[PDB]
């Protein structure tokens, strides 16, 4: 009852993958159906900037590029058990959001 959606946002693939597997297996511990994990399309932030502080010299541009990875999990369960499952420890770089679904 009262399906719950959890969103996992990060920049590192390894941390997100390990915590997603951990959370899904923890949900499976309570014998709970889980639809997922759903690998949200990664979003890329691209920025280009000129290295030279003054425009002198041949124009060379560096291209910084950041990746944002996301996973989403839907659990058909009461929210309290979802909070119990996610109450366990976390690793750096991963943000957890919970919503009513």
């Amino acid at each position: 009852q009262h399906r719950i959606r959890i969103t996992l946002s990060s920049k590192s693939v390894k941390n997100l993958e390990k915590v997603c597997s951990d959370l899904v297996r923890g949900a499976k511990d309570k014998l709970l159906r889980v639809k997922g994990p759903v690998r949200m399309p990664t979003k890329v932030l691209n920025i280009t900037t000129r290295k030279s502080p003054c425009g002198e010299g041949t124009n060379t541009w560096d291209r910084f590029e950041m990746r944002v990875h996301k996973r989403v999990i839907d659990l058909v369960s009461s929210p309290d058990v979802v909070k119990q499952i996610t109450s366990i420890t976390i690793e750096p770089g991963v943000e957890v959001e919970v919503t009513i679904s």
Binding site: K11, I47, T49, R50, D62, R63, F64, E65, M66
Partner: protein
Amino acid sequence: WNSHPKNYGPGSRVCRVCGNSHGLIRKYGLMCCRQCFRSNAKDIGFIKYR
């Protein structure tokens, strides 16, 4: 004192790190000049890939 409308333009935006009125990057609300932003790219999380 500051009677001219500074609601926009380079007279209202400065680099958050240094404070220049030129070279202001604004994409994703960085609000900094290119030199200061390139100095702290590793700090922000901006790392070269290709």
